[PDB]
Amino acid sequence: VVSHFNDCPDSHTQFCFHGTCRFLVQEDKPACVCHSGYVGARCEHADLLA
């Protein structure tokens, strides 16, 4: 009813420090969504300025 991806599973609730997470339920595949401002493989760091 909302779309085709139910936010994220209950186990991988944390796939990235600073960055949302989506889940292709059509092909089961968790991913990360970093917001403009964070940096690092796991967005663990922060863009000093922007």
Number of domains the chain contains: 1
45: containing domain: 1-50
Q: What is the helix, strand, coil percentage profile of the chain, to 5?
A: 0, 30, 70
Separation of alpha carbons 24 and 8, rounded Å:
9
Structural tokens at position 3: 């779309």
Please say whether the dihedral angle defined by the alpha carbons of residues 34, 6, 31 and 45, taken in this order, is positive or negative.
positive
CATH number for 13: 2.10.25.10
Amino acid letter for position 3: S
Residues in Cβ contact with 17 at an 8 Å cutoff, skipping those fewer than 6 apart: 38, 40, 42, 43, 44
Residues in Cβ contact with 1 at an 8 Å cutoff, skipping those fewer than 6 apart: none
